[PDB]
Design a protein around this ligand. Structure first.
Ligand code: NI
Length: 341
């Protein structure tokens, strides 16, 4: 059964609700982004209307085989009528194709569903500037002050400089980057660009990247591993055993691996600066964990919410424990008392 925080009152609509079967009263199923916890349940046998971005639509059609007649892509930043209700999709600054959804209810209420997002000051100049929001359905993944991490630009600066130094010292080093979902493509794309290489990967991952509308993509990626000195591998293979095994396959072309594991936050964030990050090393293999986040930090979240001044907040992450729910409610009340709404 579909939980309450996935239903939009006063409409026939659900958000990210595909794992509950036929939801009673649902006339349109919205999908915020192509991450498996959110699409869980979709397939070629789905026969209800799915509303989403163009990019999410490409992924539904090619990767999950959902039939074309049930895929409804909408442009961003554009007022659209869906089953007699005005909606707008906004860029969520998460993975490719990820949106927030603004719903203008027939009774006058306005609702924002963030999906998964990384809040940014640039959102204060979207179509959100123009009117009041009564209800906010909020991505609370990192809603606690301990969750600090650097900007995505600082993280990429660290990775490019680390890779370029290593391969310039040793032209026979291979760089490897882990992946297990869409998102974080700038990590491997930026490193390959500095090195003058395409990114090599499996046929399955190439297919996924080809759905993403990235400019000039044919110039940046390839299935021919031998021509490439940046390889992508599944995240599970980013360990000493998996990487040893990979270097054997390369036919003595390389004699060293430098590997990157993009994570979210880890408790080494509570003490160390990005500058000061060090790898795990065994022999000719070094592995860097880098904190490249596609979710808001606590401070970015707090800034957004204090600017939006919603009348009510419904968290969509960390909702399963009483301690989590209580902690989140406390911070929402501090923020409201501090800013005066
Ligand atoms: Ni996500």
């Amino acid at each position: 059964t579909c939980p309450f925080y996935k239903k939009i009152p006063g409409t026939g609509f659900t958000v990210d609700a595909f794992q509950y079967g036929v939801v009673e009263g649902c006339t349109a199923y919205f999908l915020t982004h192509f991450h498996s916890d959110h699409y869980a349940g979709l397939s070629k046998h789905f026969t209800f209307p799915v509303y989403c971005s163009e990019i999410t639509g490409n992924l539904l059609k090619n990767k999950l085989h959902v039939q074309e007649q049930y895929i409804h892509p909408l442009p961003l930043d554009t007022e659209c009528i869906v089953n007699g209700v005005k909606v707008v999709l906004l860029d969520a600054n998460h993975c490719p194709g990820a949106v927030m959804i603004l719903f203008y209810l027939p009774n006058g209420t306005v609702i924002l569903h963030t999906g998964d997002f990384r809040a940014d000051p640039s959102m204060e100049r979207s179509l959100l500037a123009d009117q009041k929001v009564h209800m906010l359905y909020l991505d609370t993944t990192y809603c606690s002050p301990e969750y600090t991490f650097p900007s995505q630009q600082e993280v990429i600066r660290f990775a490019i400089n680390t890779a370029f130094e290593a391969v310039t010292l040793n032209p026979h080093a291979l760089v490897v980057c882990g992946t297990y979902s869409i998102g974080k493509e700038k990590v491997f794309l930026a490193i390959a660009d500095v090195l003058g290489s395409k990114v090599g990967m499996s046929q399955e991952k190439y297919k996924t990247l080809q759905c993403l509308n990235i400019p000039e993509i044919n110039s940046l990626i390839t299935t021919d591993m031998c021509s490439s000195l940046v390889h992508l591998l599944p995240m599970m293979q980013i360990n000493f055993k998996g990487l040893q095994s990979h270097l054997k396959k390369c036919g003595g072309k390389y004699n060293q691996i430098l590997a990157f594991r993009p994570t979210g936050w880890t408790h080494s964030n509570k003490f160390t600066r990005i500058a000061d990050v060090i790898p795990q090393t065994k022999g000719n293999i070094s592995i860097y964990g880098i904190p490249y986040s596609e979710h808001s930090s606590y401070l970015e979240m707090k800034r957004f919410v204090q600017w939006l001044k919603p009348q009510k907040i419904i968290p969509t992450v960390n909702v399963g424990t009483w301690k989590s729910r209580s902690t989140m409610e406390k911070y929402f009340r501090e923020w409201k008392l501090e800013a005066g709404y």
